[PDB]
Design a binder for these strands. Structure first.
Lengths: 105, 99
DNA sequence: CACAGTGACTCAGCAG
DNA sequence: GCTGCTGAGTCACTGT
């Protein structure tokens, strides 16, 4: 049993910790309805929900940081290729303009 | 003992500051130093990731404006090259109409 | 109010 | 044993 589940059981909270954290706010409010929790039970429920949701936010925030570095390194890779491709095109245009001007003077 | 003074202290000099401390207070002070060291490692890690991100973004912005400028000037020169080739070809066909 | 995001701090645990 | 690093959880905020 997790520490959260033991604390919820100690305060006689009848809801599963998973439902406290993962229920959409509409269904969460329905679950909380028709109850009689004291301040201690309400505070622990709110603490479990906040920590459970913020845990995932931090997870997603750290995954995005790593993904953003991968996307940046890919952007650099393509830009160097596009710069190389554009320079080749500029060379063929510069060589064609030269040949034309040579043909004339 | 203030914070950074305990962090900068080597493990050898730390044992020189065991004046009147009990076996437990020596432990808690060692965990206090370790906590302060871990706080610096996380800050050192956060700084390293920030400079890496800011440097990669600096190179991307520079290369993006390089590529954008290259594509723009290439398109403008290709216009003038095509126009010069058109006049050259038009003069070519007229040159084939002589006695 | 709600949810979502984020720098900083913390601890755990692995490698050296 | 300590040292650096780093994946997570948490807090105290700010943002929509």
């Amino acid at each position: 049993l997790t520490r959260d589940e033991l604390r919820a059981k100690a305060l006689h909270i009848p809801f599963p910790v998973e439902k406290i954290i993962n229920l959409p706010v509409v269904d969460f409010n329905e679950m909380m309805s028709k109850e009689q929790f004291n301040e201690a039970q309400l505070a622990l429920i709110r603490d479990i929900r906040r920590r459970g949701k913020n845990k995932v936010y931090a997870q997603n925030c750290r995954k995005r940081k790593l993904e953003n570095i991968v996307e940046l390194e890919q952007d650099l890779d393509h830009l160097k290729d596009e710069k190389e491709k554009l320079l080749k095109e500029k060379g063929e245009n510069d060589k064609s303009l030269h040949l034309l001007k040579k043909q004339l003077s | 003992l203030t914070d950074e003074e305990l962090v900068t202290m080597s493990v050898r000099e730390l044992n020189q500051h065991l004046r009147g401390l009990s076996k437990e207070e020596i432990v808690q002070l060692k965990q206090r130093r370790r906590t302060l060291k871990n706080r610096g490692y996380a800050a050192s890690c956060r700084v390293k990731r920030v400079t890496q991100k800011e440097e990669l973004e600096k190179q991307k912005a520079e290369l993006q404006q390089e590529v954008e400028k290259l594509a723009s000037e290439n398109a403008s020169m290709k216009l003038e090259l095509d126009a010069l080739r058109s006049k050259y070809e038009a003069l070519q066909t007229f040159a084939r109409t002589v006695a």
